[PDB]
């Protein structure tokens, strides 16, 4: 079966629509998400037209095999989509109305710079390759683009699901290709990160700073070193939930900076002890007293600077 | 093959039933479960009717290909169900009796607020899309809804398996859809959490409080800091078995609150030491003596408040 | 193709046999195992009978498609078995001899109460649904039930592979079902648990008890707290290799009890120190001296009691 | 299609050959490996013979469906091999030359006793079941057994790939079976284990022994206990990369033995302290001085004994 | 369908091209990557030639089944590629233009010697087996080799995608094989390793060296031992992201060397203490003072030597 012939030298417009049934498994490390949706296709094949008076019926139902159907593929899917045809309905004028239900693992890049306070734009790219007979162009039937209310993406808030109505038409291997951009705007549910990572991380840091109210070198060494190890544990926990970015993430920046605080706390703890042994506890006292104000102020200011830089 | 024609303008009623054979793999993080069950379908196709006298036979067995079968799909499945037709039996009035055995990974949201003392309602949504010829409506044959005695969901107690008999009939992409809700009520086996997480977590906390019967700053620092790290280990262990909730879970709340107890224990340990060095051990004694009663009382009361709030 | 017609009102007896080729992947957490075996089926279809004189041949070989084959399924499999027909041989009297080679992931519940000294009974349930024409009943041909010598289940000893010869005949969705129980008796190879978990766990506990021969509070605090953490590490290691049981396991019981030993060791260490500071080292000495005998005796006795309760 | 008829009462000899294209994923815990290879089969079917003069052609190419092909299966595969027929070429005398490209996950037991200095013999078992018409026997065409130069098994050295030319002929379910043993001899690349596990493990042990040059009980307790915990971490790391063996492995033996060294080091550290407090530092000095020589000598000798026992 | 017949004794040239659509999942441990690309094939089949005047059409479109298509396979794929034919276009001269869209998990060895500053050459090997009728040779149509702009490999920079135009023609199982090498040059994004592993690892090492400004044996033991454990944690973290190499990697070398620094730091800490107790603090002072300069200088120089050796 060959494509529909043109009235004039016009391209064939295949109207599309994606209706999300189930959206799930957003893998941060793999930068993938799984989708379960309806794909609707509609084009005019004049060869399939009929008189509703003569035939008796108002629409004709065909099996995929029977008629010409455009080869619509997804660009950013890992493997070819699992698709099952729901219905093919031809109107008297030859306006075909195809509907299929699919499921696919979509590969869409994620921006972790503001993690865990980040928002993402997931993409679903519909594509059609033009045939030697005639050129095929994609369109968006906005009436058939949407999502079920039930649709939930665990640990994410679904903002919108829209399509960029004008396709990206380009040449590939000397043939015209019509690409469409279906955008799923989501924003992360940062809540859990606060009692699980952020606050525990701040508590161990504040515990380290109690060394500024202690003259006991042995106790200070225990305080700063122990807490530093809990900080390493938290850094490792965080980097396991994330991929390797060629940029600093917000949480990454905070975590990195906190190492410097531990490093300087050890230096202070060392300096204070050296001075004490050197029979200069008056100078050590001045440094320790300063550190009590210096450490939280420089911490608070450094954080303002980063939130500023990052947001 | 087209759908059965209507006597009058009535919709076609497809009677359904799910009988669970094997239920397994309830993933808390992924909010999914795997099912292995029988799906039974029954509808009237007058075109398939016959005389049992003339034909000799009391029922006719058809291969799926031979006759019209309604396109029944599952809403909340990740990929299309693995189904194998067991039997198709036509009675002479044309009452088709379809049976298939399926397996599917069902995506059903979970409520972790009362974890590990939570109970859940797992869902299985049967759906049918109406055709251009006629409208299809789902029904529940209660005689064919159930589960095998053998059926066990590891670490969960299976309460019930029922169907909401009246379908959710709604329009989707200008066509009628009949949705059915099969509900599997389960409740978690919280037992193991007690000797594995809850009690070990309480023992390390109580060990931290022995610092209230010690004047040794160096020992107290070791006691409180060490136990705090074991608490971090337990917090991490717990959050690995769970997804990121935009709400506090019961265990999450207990765990978070316990950080504050470690924080204040460090403050006490610090205050007591500062006072001792400042040659005011009488005041430090008062604080330490108070802490011995204050810490367990405020702990016990805070827990009453949370269990109250959570249950 | 319809089932064989009955001589009288007798049911059709399908003789079965499972011969294990490869048995592997026993998942303790998932309570599953993978099997690779031969399935043999034999029944009498009088319609397929022939005279060996006239035909010349002593048995006829058919392709599955050509003849009626009973729909034998497995109850406790996650997904439908991957089966490839090896041979179908019909004798002159119409005694069909079907053989297929299959592989399946079988879901069989496990009893962890005596872990790692436990023994299990893995099950393989063959089932047949009776047709409207006639009732089908399963039988066991003991001569075709067995396992290859080569068959090895890693970290387990294979005791036996037998079938419960009398089937469980019951009604399901108003039709007769013949269920057969193939039992694979295995017992765990507990050896490795001894040098990897049990003895290391006992060594850290015994190290904690050296605090009973020390007057140094700071050293005792380090001894008991450090070892307690290694005990937490071992508890976590153990519970990662196991599912969440609504009952205590033998190892679970030992592990839990050992927390109480650490708790009381801290109490002793605390009491001894308090008394020393209170200028009462004579009383502290009595307690410490007692603890040296009390701790191992109460440990040894508590263990006798548990092994007694558990075995 | 029936098997080739015999000239006399001889069995049908199917000549075999496996040529490895890609060998990968040797799972130590699962005792499996994945293979991608060519399978070549050759037998004489007199029915397919032809005159090259009359026909014109020197060999005839058939589609698998067209002719009789022996049912060759693999014994030790988890699931049935993914096979794609490359070519079927019939010579004038009726000598069929089948070639297929397959991929399979082969289950072959591993011996960990000498780990990580172990060598293994991976197996690939070809098998054929005799038919009622005639008996089928496997043979090895050595000219068609081999492996590509490119073939690499990560972290392993491939020694050889040979076939045991005489098949294991035996009865199974009253039918003759011809089994062939394809052996892939490999030996582990132990290199990485030295700077990653062995030496780090020895360094922490030697650090523990510095307690023999210290009179500070508190320091010794820290030294021995800390290092013991790093040893526990290394023991856990090792046992995660390995399955549960009913025997001791070389690394397992070394690791276990090192626990005894930590245990006795604690005993020494305890004894030395008790004696010091008891105002007997002369006796404690003797013990400590001895321990300095005793610990490395008994360590070195114990290791000679084990390497001796193990190799 | 047989292959195209030769004009003279020339081989059939199948022109090839791979156009990468989506490149993803580069597994360092498994040494695999997943690809989603277009495969284009073009050869001359004179039997399919036609007059464009008589036929009317300028190119003819065939279904794969209708015509002879060369059996092109991939050498280094784990399983056979998931391929879906996009188009088959025959020109009047019989120049076939095949296009398919595929996805495959490619197995390509990785060189970790310079990790995480390494660059790799991923391979895709196209292969064709010659038939008994005629020999088949692969060619590269450079105009149909490329990659989409969108193509991103997470944590890697894609340098180039080229094909080695002259095929590797060799005999395999007495038949000619034409192998082509498609090379994807990539280089790792080392950025993240710096704030996540390299700098944290250096901070803990520098913290250990503060023991050179302390006379407190108990504090030094805590400092060096604690930091050593954090170093073990980092070593383990690193070796989990990598496979077991029979060679030293750059990061592996740095990590290993740092153990020696901890070992010698313990020795110094021990020596200094022994001397102090021995009432020789003047000699201990000299050693400690030297260590303050020796440790960073020997560290810095050792690192120059390694970067030199490695790059
Ligand atoms: C004679 C003293 C006995 C102490 C027993 C402790 C009982 C703890 C019960 C926990 C039940 C759950 C909260 C934990 C505090 C630990 C006890 C501190 C001991 C102080 C000794 C002072 C010496 C005069
Ligand atoms: C402290 C740690 C204590 C360890 C408990 C010992 C195991 C035990 O007592 O477990 C009992 C097991 C189970 O053997 P069974 O045949 O299944 O018992 C069934 C007997 N009935 C039917 C009478 C109930 O005996 C063994 O495997 C003994 C050898 C293992 C010793 C390892 C100790 C270190
Ligand atoms: Cl697609
Ligand atoms: Cl363009
Ligand atoms: Cl074009
Ligand atoms: Cl479905
Ligand atoms: Cl089954
Ligand atoms: Cl096989
Ligand atoms: Cl391939
Ligand atoms: Na079509
Ligand atoms: Na149908
Ligand atoms: Na059949
Ligand atoms: Na300490
Ligand atoms: Na055949
Ligand atoms: Na073809």
Short mmCIF file of N, CA, C and O in Angstrom, two decimals, chain C residues 19 21-22 24 36 38 40 59 82 84-87 89 99 101 103 115 144 150 152 154-155 189 191-193 195-197 199-200 203-204 206-207 210 213-216 219 222-223 226 230 234 237 241 292, chain D residues 29 31 71 73-80 107-109 127 129 132 172-173 175 177 179 217-218 221-222 225 228-229 232 235-236 239 243-248 256 259-260 263 266-267 270 273-274 277:
data_model
loop_
_atom_site.label_atom_id
_atom_site.label_comp_id
_atom_site.label_asym_id
_atom_site.label_seq_id
_atom_site.Cartn_x
_atom_site.Cartn_y
_atom_site.Cartn_z
N UNK C 19 10.87 -33.71 35.28
CA UNK C 19 12.25 -34.17 35.43
C UNK C 19 13.15 -32.93 35.39
O UNK C 19 13.31 -32.35 34.31
N UNK C 21 16.16 -30.55 35.06
CA UNK C 21 17.40 -30.50 34.27
C UNK C 21 18.38 -29.55 34.97
O UNK C 21 19.54 -29.92 35.21
N UNK C 22 17.90 -28.34 35.30
CA UNK C 22 18.66 -27.30 35.98
C UNK C 22 17.76 -26.56 36.95
O UNK C 22 16.67 -26.11 36.61
N UNK C 24 18.05 -23.52 39.92
CA UNK C 24 18.91 -22.38 40.25
C UNK C 24 18.15 -21.15 40.80
O UNK C 24 16.92 -21.15 40.86
N UNK C 36 14.40 -25.38 35.25
CA UNK C 36 14.58 -25.78 33.86
C UNK C 36 14.36 -27.27 33.91
O UNK C 36 15.13 -27.98 34.55
N UNK C 38 11.93 -31.01 32.25
CA UNK C 38 11.12 -31.68 31.24
C UNK C 38 9.75 -31.85 31.86
O UNK C 38 9.64 -32.20 33.04
N UNK C 40 6.38 -34.07 31.07
CA UNK C 40 5.86 -35.16 30.27
C UNK C 40 4.37 -35.32 30.56
O UNK C 40 3.94 -35.26 31.71
N UNK C 59 4.40 -46.54 16.04
CA UNK C 59 4.00 -45.28 16.72
C UNK C 59 4.01 -44.15 15.69
O UNK C 59 4.85 -44.16 14.78
N UNK C 82 8.18 -20.77 29.72
CA UNK C 82 8.79 -20.76 28.39
C UNK C 82 8.90 -22.25 28.06
O UNK C 82 9.69 -22.96 28.69
N UNK C 84 9.03 -25.47 25.05
CA UNK C 84 9.37 -25.93 23.71
C UNK C 84 9.13 -27.44 23.67
O UNK C 84 9.73 -28.19 24.46
N UNK C 85 8.20 -27.87 22.80
CA UNK C 85 7.80 -29.26 22.62
C UNK C 85 8.96 -30.05 22.04
O UNK C 85 9.57 -29.64 21.05
N UNK C 86 9.31 -31.15 22.73
CA UNK C 86 10.39 -32.05 22.38
C UNK C 86 9.84 -33.16 21.49
O UNK C 86 10.43 -33.42 20.44
N UNK C 87 8.72 -33.80 21.89
CA UNK C 87 8.13 -34.91 21.15
C UNK C 87 6.68 -35.23 21.55
O UNK C 87 6.28 -35.01 22.70
N UNK C 89 4.30 -38.63 20.70
CA UNK C 89 4.31 -39.99 20.16
C UNK C 89 3.01 -40.76 20.49
O UNK C 89 2.71 -40.98 21.67
N UNK C 99 6.00 -34.63 25.48
CA UNK C 99 7.18 -34.21 26.21
C UNK C 99 7.58 -32.85 25.72
O UNK C 99 7.62 -32.59 24.52
N UNK C 101 10.17 -29.27 27.03
CA UNK C 101 11.19 -28.79 27.93
C UNK C 101 10.79 -27.36 28.30
O UNK C 101 10.44 -26.56 27.41
N UNK C 103 11.10 -23.86 31.26
CA UNK C 103 11.82 -23.05 32.22
C UNK C 103 10.80 -22.09 32.81
O UNK C 103 9.98 -21.56 32.07
N UNK C 115 16.46 -20.03 60.35
CA UNK C 115 17.57 -19.48 59.55
C UNK C 115 18.82 -19.20 60.39
O UNK C 115 18.68 -18.66 61.49
N UNK C 144 8.45 -41.02 35.56
CA UNK C 144 8.83 -39.85 34.80
C UNK C 144 8.97 -38.59 35.69
O UNK C 144 8.99 -37.46 35.18
N UNK C 150 23.56 -33.87 38.11
CA UNK C 150 24.23 -32.57 37.93
C UNK C 150 23.56 -31.42 38.71
O UNK C 150 24.28 -30.52 39.16
N UNK C 152 22.20 -28.71 40.92
CA UNK C 152 22.75 -28.10 42.12
C UNK C 152 22.08 -26.75 42.39
O UNK C 152 21.95 -25.90 41.49
N UNK C 154 22.80 -23.62 44.51
CA UNK C 154 23.87 -22.91 45.22
C UNK C 154 23.47 -22.56 46.65
O UNK C 154 22.41 -21.96 46.84
N UNK C 155 24.31 -22.97 47.61
CA UNK C 155 24.13 -22.73 49.04
C UNK C 155 23.01 -23.52 49.69
O UNK C 155 22.59 -23.20 50.81
N UNK C 189 22.82 -24.75 53.53
CA UNK C 189 24.23 -24.95 53.83
C UNK C 189 24.66 -23.78 54.73
O UNK C 189 25.15 -22.73 54.26
N UNK C 191 27.12 -23.55 56.84
CA UNK C 191 28.57 -23.46 57.05
C UNK C 191 29.12 -22.03 57.04
O UNK C 191 29.67 -21.59 58.04
N UNK C 192 29.01 -21.34 55.90
CA UNK C 192 29.54 -19.99 55.67
C UNK C 192 29.12 -18.96 56.71
O UNK C 192 29.92 -18.10 57.06
N UNK C 193 27.88 -19.08 57.25
CA UNK C 193 27.34 -18.17 58.27
C UNK C 193 28.18 -18.14 59.54
O UNK C 193 28.28 -17.08 60.17
N UNK C 195 31.84 -18.64 59.99
CA UNK C 195 33.00 -17.71 59.98
C UNK C 195 32.71 -16.28 59.48
O UNK C 195 33.58 -15.40 59.64
N UNK C 196 31.54 -16.05 58.86
CA UNK C 196 31.20 -14.76 58.28
C UNK C 196 30.33 -13.84 59.12
O UNK C 196 30.45 -12.62 58.99
N UNK C 197 29.41 -14.42 59.91
CA UNK C 197 28.48 -13.65 60.74
C UNK C 197 28.54 -14.07 62.19
O UNK C 197 28.83 -13.22 63.02
N UNK C 199 30.59 -16.18 64.30
CA UNK C 199 31.82 -15.96 65.07
C UNK C 199 32.27 -14.48 65.09
O UNK C 199 32.43 -13.98 66.21
N UNK C 200 32.37 -13.73 63.95
CA UNK C 200 32.73 -12.30 64.06
C UNK C 200 31.84 -11.54 65.06
O UNK C 200 32.37 -10.82 65.91
N UNK C 203 32.94 -12.47 68.60
CA UNK C 203 34.22 -11.85 68.93
C UNK C 203 34.05 -10.41 69.37
O UNK C 203 34.64 -10.04 70.38
N UNK C 204 33.24 -9.60 68.65
CA UNK C 204 33.01 -8.19 69.02
C UNK C 204 32.31 -8.10 70.39
O UNK C 204 32.67 -7.25 71.18
N UNK C 206 32.56 -10.39 72.88
CA UNK C 206 33.55 -10.77 73.88
C UNK C 206 34.54 -9.64 74.12
O UNK C 206 34.90 -9.39 75.27
N UNK C 207 34.89 -8.88 73.06
CA UNK C 207 35.76 -7.70 73.15
C UNK C 207 35.08 -6.65 74.06
O UNK C 207 35.74 -6.09 74.93
N UNK C 210 35.65 -7.03 77.84
CA UNK C 210 36.96 -6.74 78.44
C UNK C 210 36.87 -5.48 79.37
O UNK C 210 37.73 -5.30 80.23
N UNK C 213 37.29 -5.80 83.05
CA UNK C 213 38.65 -5.90 83.57
C UNK C 213 39.37 -4.56 83.40
O UNK C 213 40.60 -4.49 83.38
N UNK C 214 38.57 -3.47 83.30
CA UNK C 214 39.06 -2.11 83.17
C UNK C 214 38.29 -1.14 84.05
O UNK C 214 37.06 -1.21 84.12
N UNK C 215 39.03 -0.24 84.71
CA UNK C 215 38.51 0.82 85.60
C UNK C 215 38.41 2.19 84.87
O UNK C 215 37.82 3.14 85.39
N UNK C 216 38.97 2.24 83.63
CA UNK C 216 39.01 3.38 82.73
C UNK C 216 37.67 3.59 82.01
O UNK C 216 37.41 2.94 80.99
N UNK C 219 37.91 4.33 78.30
CA UNK C 219 38.22 3.13 77.53
C UNK C 219 36.99 2.22 77.38
O UNK C 219 36.70 1.74 76.28
N UNK C 222 34.47 3.54 74.88
CA UNK C 222 35.01 3.23 73.55
C UNK C 222 34.78 1.76 73.22
O UNK C 222 34.18 1.46 72.19
N UNK C 223 35.18 0.85 74.12
CA UNK C 223 35.00 -0.59 73.93
C UNK C 223 33.55 -0.97 73.63
O UNK C 223 33.28 -1.48 72.54
N UNK C 226 31.84 1.17 70.42
CA UNK C 226 32.44 0.73 69.15
C UNK C 226 31.89 -0.62 68.71
O UNK C 226 31.33 -0.74 67.61
N UNK C 230 29.55 -2.20 65.43
CA UNK C 230 29.91 -3.37 64.60
C UNK C 230 28.75 -4.35 64.64
O UNK C 230 28.40 -4.93 63.61
N UNK C 234 26.43 -5.77 61.49
CA UNK C 234 26.10 -7.17 61.31
C UNK C 234 24.59 -7.40 61.26
O UNK C 234 24.14 -8.10 60.35
N UNK C 237 23.53 -6.16 57.84
CA UNK C 237 24.02 -7.13 56.84
C UNK C 237 23.07 -8.33 56.74
O UNK C 237 22.69 -8.70 55.63
N UNK C 241 19.95 -9.75 53.59
CA UNK C 241 19.86 -11.11 52.97
C UNK C 241 18.49 -11.80 53.21
O UNK C 241 18.33 -12.96 52.84
N UNK C 292 31.79 -10.00 85.35
CA UNK C 292 32.78 -10.88 84.71
C UNK C 292 32.26 -12.32 84.57
O UNK C 292 32.59 -12.97 83.59
N UNK D 29 28.63 -14.57 41.97
CA UNK D 29 27.50 -14.87 42.85
C UNK D 29 26.48 -15.83 42.20
O UNK D 29 26.09 -16.82 42.85
N UNK D 31 26.98 -17.72 39.45
CA UNK D 31 27.72 -18.78 38.76
C UNK D 31 27.19 -18.99 37.32
O UNK D 31 26.89 -20.11 36.92
N UNK D 71 16.76 -31.59 16.64
CA UNK D 71 16.43 -30.76 17.80
C UNK D 71 17.58 -30.78 18.80
O UNK D 71 17.59 -31.60 19.74
N UNK D 73 19.61 -29.00 21.73
CA UNK D 73 19.34 -28.12 22.85
C UNK D 73 20.59 -28.04 23.72
O UNK D 73 21.51 -28.84 23.56
N UNK D 74 20.63 -27.04 24.60
CA UNK D 74 21.71 -26.83 25.55
C UNK D 74 21.19 -27.29 26.91
O UNK D 74 20.03 -27.01 27.25
N UNK D 75 22.00 -28.02 27.67
CA UNK D 75 21.54 -28.51 28.95
C UNK D 75 21.55 -27.37 30.00
O UNK D 75 20.51 -27.04 30.59
N UNK D 76 22.76 -26.79 30.21
CA UNK D 76 23.01 -25.80 31.25
C UNK D 76 22.67 -24.35 30.89
O UNK D 76 23.32 -23.44 31.38
N UNK D 77 21.63 -24.11 30.10
CA UNK D 77 21.19 -22.74 29.82
C UNK D 77 19.99 -22.48 30.73
O UNK D 77 19.28 -23.43 31.05
N UNK D 78 19.80 -21.23 31.18
CA UNK D 78 18.68 -20.82 32.04
C UNK D 78 17.36 -20.82 31.25
O UNK D 78 16.38 -21.47 31.64
N UNK D 79 17.35 -20.07 30.14
CA UNK D 79 16.24 -20.06 29.19
C UNK D 79 16.74 -20.57 27.85
O UNK D 79 17.96 -20.60 27.62
N UNK D 80 15.82 -21.02 26.98
CA UNK D 80 16.13 -21.51 25.64
C UNK D 80 16.89 -20.41 24.87
O UNK D 80 16.49 -19.24 24.91
N UNK D 107 24.71 -21.55 32.72
CA UNK D 107 24.83 -21.79 34.15
C UNK D 107 25.93 -22.82 34.34
O UNK D 107 25.77 -23.96 33.94
N UNK D 108 27.08 -22.40 34.85
CA UNK D 108 28.19 -23.31 35.07
C UNK D 108 28.76 -23.07 36.46
O UNK D 108 29.09 -21.93 36.81
N UNK D 109 28.83 -24.16 37.28
CA UNK D 109 29.33 -24.02 38.66
C UNK D 109 30.77 -23.58 38.73
O UNK D 109 31.59 -23.97 37.88
N UNK D 127 23.05 -31.20 23.55
CA UNK D 127 22.32 -32.45 23.74
C UNK D 127 21.30 -32.67 22.61
O UNK D 127 20.78 -31.71 22.05
N UNK D 129 17.96 -35.54 21.63
CA UNK D 129 17.13 -36.66 22.05
C UNK D 129 16.81 -37.48 20.82
O UNK D 129 16.43 -36.94 19.78
N UNK D 132 11.67 -41.86 17.91
CA UNK D 132 11.17 -43.23 17.85
C UNK D 132 11.60 -43.95 16.57
O UNK D 132 11.87 -45.16 16.60
N UNK D 172 17.31 -41.43 29.12
CA UNK D 172 16.54 -40.46 29.88
C UNK D 172 15.11 -40.58 29.41
O UNK D 172 14.86 -40.51 28.21
N UNK D 173 14.18 -40.86 30.34
CA UNK D 173 12.76 -41.08 30.07
C UNK D 173 12.54 -42.05 28.89
O UNK D 173 11.87 -41.73 27.91
N UNK D 175 14.50 -42.93 26.43
CA UNK D 175 15.06 -42.52 25.14
C UNK D 175 16.54 -42.17 25.25
O UNK D 175 16.97 -41.59 26.25
N UNK D 177 20.01 -40.22 24.70
CA UNK D 177 20.41 -38.82 24.68
C UNK D 177 21.92 -38.72 24.48
O UNK D 177 22.66 -39.37 25.19
N UNK D 179 25.02 -36.31 24.79
CA UNK D 179 25.49 -35.07 25.44
C UNK D 179 26.97 -34.80 25.08
O UNK D 179 27.79 -35.72 25.13
N UNK D 217 46.59 2.53 77.44
CA UNK D 217 45.44 1.64 77.26
C UNK D 217 44.37 2.23 76.36
O UNK D 217 43.88 1.54 75.46
N UNK D 218 44.04 3.51 76.58
CA UNK D 218 43.04 4.26 75.83
C UNK D 218 43.43 4.33 74.33
O UNK D 218 42.58 4.08 73.46
N UNK D 221 43.21 0.60 72.85
CA UNK D 221 41.79 0.29 72.66
C UNK D 221 41.30 0.90 71.34
O UNK D 221 40.74 0.17 70.53
N UNK D 222 41.64 2.18 71.09
CA UNK D 222 41.31 2.90 69.85
C UNK D 222 41.97 2.23 68.66
O UNK D 222 41.27 1.87 67.72
N UNK D 225 40.47 -1.66 68.21
CA UNK D 225 39.04 -1.64 67.92
C UNK D 225 38.74 -1.01 66.56
O UNK D 225 38.02 -1.62 65.75
N UNK D 228 39.88 -3.18 63.67
CA UNK D 228 39.00 -4.35 63.65
C UNK D 228 37.75 -4.06 62.84
O UNK D 228 37.29 -4.93 62.10
N UNK D 229 37.21 -2.84 62.99
CA UNK D 229 36.02 -2.38 62.29
C UNK D 229 36.30 -2.25 60.78
O UNK D 229 35.51 -2.74 59.98
N UNK D 232 36.23 -5.65 59.50
CA UNK D 232 34.82 -6.06 59.30
C UNK D 232 34.33 -5.53 57.94
O UNK D 232 33.81 -6.31 57.13
N UNK D 235 35.87 -7.61 55.21
CA UNK D 235 35.21 -8.93 55.20
C UNK D 235 33.85 -8.81 54.47
O UNK D 235 33.61 -9.59 53.55
N UNK D 236 33.00 -7.82 54.84
CA UNK D 236 31.70 -7.58 54.20
C UNK D 236 31.86 -7.30 52.70
O UNK D 236 31.14 -7.90 51.89
N UNK D 239 32.64 -10.69 50.93
CA UNK D 239 31.50 -11.61 50.89
C UNK D 239 30.33 -11.11 50.02
O UNK D 239 29.54 -11.96 49.59
N UNK D 243 29.42 -15.94 46.29
CA UNK D 243 28.27 -16.71 46.80
C UNK D 243 28.63 -17.49 48.08
O UNK D 243 29.82 -17.62 48.45
N UNK D 244 27.59 -18.00 48.75
CA UNK D 244 27.76 -18.75 49.99
C UNK D 244 28.18 -20.20 49.72
O UNK D 244 27.38 -21.06 49.33
N UNK D 245 29.47 -20.45 49.91
CA UNK D 245 30.15 -21.73 49.72
C UNK D 245 30.07 -22.65 50.96
O UNK D 245 30.25 -22.17 52.09
N UNK D 246 29.84 -23.97 50.80
CA UNK D 246 29.85 -24.87 51.96
C UNK D 246 31.29 -25.25 52.37
O UNK D 246 31.51 -26.26 53.02
N UNK D 247 32.27 -24.43 51.94
CA UNK D 247 33.69 -24.61 52.15
C UNK D 247 34.37 -23.26 52.35
O UNK D 247 33.82 -22.22 51.98
N UNK D 248 35.58 -23.30 52.89
CA UNK D 248 36.36 -22.10 53.09
C UNK D 248 37.09 -21.78 51.79
O UNK D 248 37.57 -22.69 51.10
N UNK D 256 39.16 -14.71 58.04
CA UNK D 256 38.72 -15.30 59.31
C UNK D 256 39.82 -15.34 60.36
O UNK D 256 39.60 -14.92 61.50
N UNK D 259 40.67 -12.20 62.32
CA UNK D 259 39.79 -11.88 63.46
C UNK D 259 40.44 -12.35 64.75
O UNK D 259 40.43 -11.62 65.75
N UNK D 260 41.04 -13.56 64.73
CA UNK D 260 41.71 -14.15 65.88
C UNK D 260 42.88 -13.29 66.34
O UNK D 260 43.09 -13.14 67.55
N UNK D 263 41.39 -10.40 68.17
CA UNK D 263 40.92 -10.89 69.44
C UNK D 263 42.05 -11.03 70.45
O UNK D 263 41.92 -10.52 71.56
N UNK D 266 43.48 -7.59 71.52
CA UNK D 266 42.63 -7.02 72.59
C UNK D 266 43.02 -7.68 73.92
O UNK D 266 43.34 -6.96 74.88
N UNK D 267 43.06 -9.03 73.97
CA UNK D 267 43.47 -9.74 75.18
C UNK D 267 44.81 -9.18 75.69
O UNK D 267 44.86 -8.78 76.85
N UNK D 270 44.48 -5.66 77.13
CA UNK D 270 43.73 -5.80 78.39
C UNK D 270 44.66 -6.26 79.53
O UNK D 270 44.66 -5.66 80.62
N UNK D 273 47.28 -3.69 80.54
CA UNK D 273 46.63 -2.66 81.36
C UNK D 273 46.34 -3.14 82.77
O UNK D 273 46.65 -2.42 83.72
N UNK D 274 45.73 -4.34 82.91
CA UNK D 274 45.40 -4.92 84.21
C UNK D 274 46.66 -4.96 85.10
O UNK D 274 46.66 -4.40 86.21
N UNK D 277 47.89 -1.42 86.24
CA UNK D 277 47.04 -0.95 87.35
C UNK D 277 47.38 -1.71 88.66
O UNK D 277 47.50 -1.08 89.72
#
